[PDB]
From a paper:
MtrD works in conjunction with the MtrC periplasmic membrane fusion protein and MtrE outer membrane channel to actively export antimicrobials out of bacterial cells. Each protomer contains 12 transmembrane helices (TM1 to TM12) and a large periplasmic domain, which can be divided into six subdomains (PN1, PN2, PC1, PC2, DN, and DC).
To elucidate how MtrDCR103 recognizes macrolide antibiotics in solution, we incubated a 2-μM MtrDCR103-nanodisc sample with 10 μM Ery for 2 hours to form the MtrDCR103-Ery complex. We determined a cryo-EM structure of this complex to a resolution of 2.72 Å. The overall structure of MtrDCR103-Ery is almost identical to that of Amp bound (labeled as MtrDCR103-Amp), with the three protomers displaying the access, binding, and extrusion forms. In the binding protomer of MtrDCR103, the cryo-EM images depict that an additional large density corresponding to the bound Ery drug was found at the distal multidrug binding site. It is somewhat surprisingly that the observed large Ery molecule is anchored within this deep pocket. The binding of Ery is extensive; within 4.5 Å of this bound drug, there are seven aromatic, two hydrophobic, two polar, and one positively charged residues that provide aromatic stacking and hydrophobic and electrostatic interactions to facilitate Ery binding. These important binding residues are F136, I139, R174, F176, S275, T277, Y325, F568, V607, F610, F612, and F623. Likewise, the cryo-EM structure of the MtrDCR103-Ery complex depicts that there are 23 PE lipids that are similarly oriented as the lipids in the Amp-bound structure.
Numbering used by the authors:
A (entry chain C): 51 to 150
B (entry chain B): 1 to 1043
C (entry chain A): 101 to 250
D (entry chain C): 699 to 748
E (entry chain A): 300 to 349
F (entry chain C): 848 to 897
Amino acid sequence: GASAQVMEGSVLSVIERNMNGVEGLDYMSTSADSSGSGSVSLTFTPDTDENLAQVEVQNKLSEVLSTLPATVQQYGVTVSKARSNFLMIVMLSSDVQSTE
Amino acid sequence: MAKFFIDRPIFAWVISIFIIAAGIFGIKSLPVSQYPSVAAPTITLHAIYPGASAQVMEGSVLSVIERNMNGVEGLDYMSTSADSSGSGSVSLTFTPDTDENLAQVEVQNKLSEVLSTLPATVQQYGVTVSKARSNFLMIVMLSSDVQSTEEMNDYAQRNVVPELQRIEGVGQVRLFGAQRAMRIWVDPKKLQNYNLSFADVGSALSAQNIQISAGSIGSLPAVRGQTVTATVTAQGQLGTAEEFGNVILRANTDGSNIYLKDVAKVGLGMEDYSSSTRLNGVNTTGMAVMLSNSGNAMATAKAVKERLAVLEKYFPQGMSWKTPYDTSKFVEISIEKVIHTLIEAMVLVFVVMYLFLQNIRYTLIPTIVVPISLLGGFAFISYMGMSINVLTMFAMILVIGIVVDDAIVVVENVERIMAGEGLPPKEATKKAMGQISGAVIGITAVLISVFVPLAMFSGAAGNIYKQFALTMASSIAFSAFLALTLTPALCATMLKTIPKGHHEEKKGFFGWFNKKFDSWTHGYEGRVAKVLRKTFRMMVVYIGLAVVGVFLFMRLPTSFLPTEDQGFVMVSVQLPAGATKERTDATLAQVTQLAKSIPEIENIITVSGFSFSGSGQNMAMGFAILKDWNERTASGSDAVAVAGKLTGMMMGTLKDGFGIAVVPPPILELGNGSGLSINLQDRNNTGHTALLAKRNELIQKMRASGLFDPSTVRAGGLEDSPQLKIDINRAAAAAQGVSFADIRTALASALSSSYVSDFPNQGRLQRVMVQADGDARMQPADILNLTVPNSSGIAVPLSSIATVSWQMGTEQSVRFNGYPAMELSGSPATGVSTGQAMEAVQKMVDELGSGYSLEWGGQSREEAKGGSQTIALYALAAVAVFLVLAALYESWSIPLAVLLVMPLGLAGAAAGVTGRNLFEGLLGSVPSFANDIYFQVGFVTVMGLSAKNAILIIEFAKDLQAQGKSAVEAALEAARLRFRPIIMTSFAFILGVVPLYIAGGASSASQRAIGTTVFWGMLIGTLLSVFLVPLFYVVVRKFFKET
Amino acid sequence: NLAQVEVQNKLSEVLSTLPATVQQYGVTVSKARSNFLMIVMLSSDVQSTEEMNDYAQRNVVPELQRIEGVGQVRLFGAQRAMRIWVDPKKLQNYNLSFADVGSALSAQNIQISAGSIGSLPAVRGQTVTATVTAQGQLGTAEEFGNVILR
Amino acid sequence: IQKMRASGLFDPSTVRAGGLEDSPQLKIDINRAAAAAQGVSFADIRTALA
Amino acid sequence: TAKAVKERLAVLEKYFPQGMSWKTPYDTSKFVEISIEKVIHTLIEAMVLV
Amino acid sequence: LGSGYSLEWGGQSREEAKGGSQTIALYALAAVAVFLVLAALYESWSIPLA
Ligand SMILES: CC[C@H]1OC(=O)[C@H](C)[C@@H](O[C@H]2C[C@@](C)(OC)[C@@H](O)[C@H](C)O2)[C@H](C)[C@@H](O[C@@H]2O[C@H](C)C[C@H](N(C)C)[C@H]2O)[C@](C)(O)C[C@@H](C)C(=O)[C@H](C)[C@@H](O)[C@]1(C)O
Ligand SMILES: CCCCCCCCCCCCCCCCCCCC(=O)O[C@H](COC(=O)CCCCCCCCCCCCCC)COP(=O)(O)OCCN
């Protein structure tokens, strides 16, 4: 139940502003959509570890989680240190049952 | 190596170029801060529970959170603090060898599994989990005098805070003040008139103000033939006060709906209303900047100032920004002092070399070799992950005197060989290298073995010693490598052959100086020959001097860091129990009027509602910032004199309450003067009165029947205060139609506040609170008029249900390791060991019944450990030095003679410190020198220099005895040969340390503390060694006839 | 450490989809061995095993589970609590049920937070401030025995 | 995007925006005065829209 | 860990109520320490035999 | 376009920008390394120049 500007101005912008100062942070990118969702991607720099970066991001996010709206805290903010390009695509085919 | 690099100067030059490049790369790639991280990982929670006492908050939130924080890897101890302000704190101090990020994530995970068992309001406000470590950089104060403090806070949070935390190097920006919210002051008289309640207001605010989520028209699981889909929007929240004032509280059939503006008043206000900051009397908004790791302090401060100017170019009319305090100028002053010291040392070395060698091409070698050693040390400290701070700069300043002596001795030996044998520079350099290579290697090994144990201590003191150790040892190693690699090449290429007998036909001032120096050398040789004749009396005199030095060292006060004039003094004001904030504001105004009456104070910052001792309406604190050191060069102008004057003016002016001014010492983890802290814990949970009685009994035992300086033994917590407890009678309530939730609702609606809903105020969400019209809740006779509703109506005046009375309740609750604890702060007077005092305190606590324990807190936890690691480390270092000297000299007796010069420097340093203390005392001043870390560093430096000189003398005396000379003749020749380089190096070191002896200004305590020690130690050590080293050699040669 | 961090992250995402009782009791994550290193006894002849279990949970278990190397301390028992054994033969007489008992216990044993007389946002001329306290809670057996069901 | 096309360096049919193609939406403006004068609480509208 | 637990128990025994005691009839560190001592004795015997 | 509208890169393009000032630095570093190595090995300032 939020706009593309309310989600940023109330949830994403706060995390983006409080996520500065992390060691190895190269840049950030915030993207909110009209479906009531937002994504803050932090792209780190070389000479940086992945687990330490995730731990520092979680520490910075938890100390600022007391300011976000109540419904966001109910749903929670999920962390994903995963890639975005596809390696394989498995396809299941059948003629005796539907796709559901 | 000495002969390999003498025929290949280009290879040595390439190695030096690589070292310089690595040093420059490390210097450009090092963090910059005023002090390193010497504390341990600490995690804090800071829960919020408004409108509650200390016991309720503690037993409801803090105990529940503390009983689950058991099992975290690396937990040292934990403490719990609660007050009457409505806040709590659970501080977990972690054992070393622990990462603070892992500790914080573990604490958050442990709190996540117990958060659902806390009260509803605690979950609404939330529980934070942060780390106590902070790298403070600057303070940005915004003062308008034309706008409210809440307006300035909102402006800073909306246009200033997000602009400062985006700068390179900034790690955190913290605002001091409550945010903005929508406050509704509800008059209870209107509610009782319209027959309403606070629950009705809460329901109306939570129902009329809610976010609506509609969805999409033409959603995906649609019917065949859909071509358009659109998101549906619906606004169901309020954002202005007029909209909140139209909230319907009750709708009737005929109409006449009761709005929120008919029984209450809505408006924008603050969320806490507690703290208030003022700068010189005007309203101010506080913003604290914390420096980030792997960042710079000077560049970050400059960028912050530039951004602040660019923002003030858009500020409204009346606002103004200031930066009264900044910890980035201390490292600036330290770097400029290091550069000035390096330049002065180079000038002194040039002067002494031109005076003693009578040529100009001898002075270029030290000037070329010293900066390379400094760059190598910088590169090493950059490789080890260290940073540039005051301690590293002081270590670099202290190591300048040692890195030049290698080049000095090399050039002196080369020049002596060239003037004696008349050989060209190549052969003379080869001979000098073949003579002194093993000696240089042994000296380097001894210095490394002496400086290694400094980096093996535990605690904050160990972290402080590690900087000096890793800097000085690296600088010494690089200087040794340069003296073995580049110095011989420069001496062989940059020098020219001296004609036969060229010195004598020379005349003028140089001839007179040569004549005088030769006469002094002959006199010194005669005196040494006289000393080598009466060996028994000289040895007994040496033993007497050593025992006197040991006695003078053992009779010195012990400390960690001398108090430094940081440029500001803190002031804590406390009022009687039950005082409101108006009296505290009046006292703060009086304190400001008194502080601006002192010409040494530039800006005064007063904070009302917060103090380090406690947080309450009667507590207050302020920070009087002083002017620059250049404008405070007088007697009664330092921080201590200003603090004394402020205290004297407060004790004669402050009628209500008392205020004490203290100058903040160096790093608070290594804080001296606190004495000895104890925490008395109740094991069986007997109560508060029993624990207070036991605390009073322990205080009486330590004061009268003890030795803990009765002028210091006192409680350090907070005495009880009058309260207004309400004892409800369940029998009387059961006899009527009143339930027990009715009393709870009435008490929650009467005094305390409530957090009901949220609202968007121009982009950001803010809270909506109800304070119940504070005009009513002013007198104690207001709760006794609260009529609590019965089953049908409300007729009970609450005097038949409960009885109100006055009692003495605690205003602060403290727990230590899961037990109720009370803190005490004693102090030994003087000449009494802290170990025996701690044993006496432990025995006294054991005298009480089984169920009352004691535990140390702060620095006492480290003092509880026996001081055996230092003695063991020093013994191991001495054994390593003996082994290295035995491997060098190839004997078991010569190291015994070399090790006899250690007590000389110690006695000299102790005598110098005692003399300076006496001079300060007789002239009215107080003794400012003790046995601190700087004294130990200076003593280690002077003992290393004395060991180097003794090693050189003993090597020259031993290699001259294998040619057919006796011990006395060999010692005399070695002394006559080593007289000149020792004198030159001593003069250079003393003239370079003199600027640190009378240092006055920024960071002058540590400067003088190291300068006096090193100066007197070097002077006495040289004066004693030049006559006692040959004596020790002769004694060891005659006592242990070799194999 | 990282494995436990990711496990906590995965558990926090499905913790709200569990029953109310599981959230009341909570889910405990641990990393320790399944075998025992030692067994500590608390033999006595004056107190029963319930008092000894309570004392061990209050003073012995927390002191032992904070030692370096300890992964878990399982007490063969449980701490003290207030047990209410209801007779269903008597609930039918007064037409009562377990829901009434639970509601009475939750409504008559709730902590009260009063506040402060003379709070900070006050009138000009306020000199005295006092914290108001009310117990509103039961901690004794005969106090719980007097809970009003009707 | 317009000046990137027809410039020789970028080929057409590839220069595209990465936006979400801002769309028309339905806006529902609630009148609290009418809902109060007719006897409709603000929670009923929220339940109906949800 | 066993040594630390035993030391903590010996320290906490001073606060126990009158009547109760403590003991660890099941402990695995004793076997380890006795095995280490036996192996050290065997090493000393081998040294003297050589 | 004017001021205020800056430009940022995404994906490999940023890396391509990083390849704008690193090539000259790499070439200079290789040249100076060869010079220093030759001067240290052959003991001359003229051989590496040639
Ligand atoms: C170099 C270490 C510095 O420590 C801090 O700055 C920390 C960050 C604050 O304490 C910390 C202490 C801490 C950690 O306590 C738990 C924290 O929670 C609070 C906010 O202040 C300080 C003293 C600020 O106090 C706070 O100023 C705010 C404008 C209002 C706030 N008040 C409403 C409460 C008050 O406390 C204040 C005034 O900037 C101090 C300025 C004036 C100084 O000159 C002093 C010398 C500081 O440079 C400092 C002590 O050297
Ligand atoms: C009569 C005889 C006279 C003989 C000679 C007289 C006195 C000569 C005095 C010479 C002074 C030399 C000054 C050196 C300039 C220091 C520049 C430091 C640059 C830097 O950051 O570090 C370098 C680049 O690293 C990177 O990879 C960063 C990438 C960007 C670097 C941009 C620099 C381009 C090339 C500049 C030349 C570099 C100097 C040559 C090394 C690598 O240094 P390092 O840490 O690798 O050191 C090797 C450790 N084993």
